[PDB]
Amino acid sequence: DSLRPKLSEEQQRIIAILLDAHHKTYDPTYSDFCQFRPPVRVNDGGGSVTLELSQLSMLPHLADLVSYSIQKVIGFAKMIPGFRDLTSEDQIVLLKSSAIEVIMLRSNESFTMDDMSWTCGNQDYKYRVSDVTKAGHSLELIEPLIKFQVGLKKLNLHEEEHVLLMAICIVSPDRPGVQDAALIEAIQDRLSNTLQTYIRCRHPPPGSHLLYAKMIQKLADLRSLNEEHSKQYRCLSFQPECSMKLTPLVLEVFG
Numbered sequence: 001d002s003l004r005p006k007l008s009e010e011q012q013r014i015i016a017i018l019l020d021a022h023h024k025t026y027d028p029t030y031s032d033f034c035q036f037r038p039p040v041r042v043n044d045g046g047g048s049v050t051l052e053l054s055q056l057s058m059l060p061h062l063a064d065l066v067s068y069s070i071q072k073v074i075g076f077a078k079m080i081p082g083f084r085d086l087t088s089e090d091q092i093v094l095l096k097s098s099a100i101e102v103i104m105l106r107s108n109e110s111f112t113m114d115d116m117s118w119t120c121g122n123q124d125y126k127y128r129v130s131d132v133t134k135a136g137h138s139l140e141l142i143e144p145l146i147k148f149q150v151g152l153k154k155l156n157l158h159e160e161e162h163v164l165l166m167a168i169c170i171v172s173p174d175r176p177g178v179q180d181a182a183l184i185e186a187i188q189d190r191l192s193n194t195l196q197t198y199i200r201c202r203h204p205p206p207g208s209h210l211l212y213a214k215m216i217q218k219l220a221d222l223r224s225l226n227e228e229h230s231k232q233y234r235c236l237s238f239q240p241e242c243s244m245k246l247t248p249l250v251l252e253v254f255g
């Protein structure tokens with residue numbers, strides 16, 4: 001068959017809305033980053049867990065970055081066609097459960113394979129593996145995260161595919177605590193069908209080969225990264241005075 005149906009008017013509108021939503025919630029110049037608590041990088045070439053936890057030098061800055069990003073993701077989610085049709089309870093459940101995953105996805109835009117870092121400006125706003133360990137996280141999360149970023153980067157997603165993937169990630173019916181899974185699934189299916197249709201008629205080969213399957217696999221990968229992040233957040237939370245280095249939003253989402 002190899003049918004390549006055209007995007008429906010609705011699907012075109014959905015894509016346009018998501019692109020617009022992303023453009024309004026993701027500043028590619030990272031101009032607000034100077035408003036976060038300043039990044040501080042202490043000497044830790046040894047990757048000392050003891051020293052990292054005692055200082056957590058990069059936590060205030062990166063926690064502010066994550067908090068800021070969660071706010072943007074909330075804004076993005078609210079613009080996803082159908083998201084407003086869900087109960088506030090389900091909206092919050094989806095946002096809290098997908099927050100870190102969407103952050104990982106959206107961060108791919110600042111990630112660069114030039115030096116395997118998230119470059120958001122001058123050296124000050126260039127985040128490397130070492131900066132994440134300075135925030136209290138370990139390689140058990142960072143290494144696979146980097147691998148995830150590279151794999152995602154190599155898919156060479158169109159922005160349309162990128163925003164659809166984030167939307168699909170958020171509107172997932174298999175999140176613990178969801179009430180109306182059926183409605184959430186209907187919304188996700190509409191987005192998934194849009195993505196499948198877009199890839200089949202807009203993505204040139206050979207990058208289109210099994211692209212949809214590869215994208216869905218990334219969503220599965222995110223679940224694992226989510227779980228690992230939650231475990232590390234727990235440990236991090238055990239460190240005295242940690243709450244002060246976080247933010248109310250971060251504490252609620254991951255607490």
Ligand SMILES: C=C1/C(=C\C=C2/CCC[C@]3(CCCCCCC(C)(C)O)CCC[C@@H]23)C[C@@H](O)C[C@@H]1O
Pocket residue numbers: 062063065066069103104106107108109110111118120127132135233236246250254
């Ligand atoms: C956010 C965004 C950015 C980078 C994301 C990064 C780079 C640094 C390390 C991170 C974020 C830093 C995590 C700090 C620990 C946060 C808590 C909640 C305490 O565990 C790991 C997940 C995503 C990674 C910059 C820009 O692309 C916006 C994007 O939303």
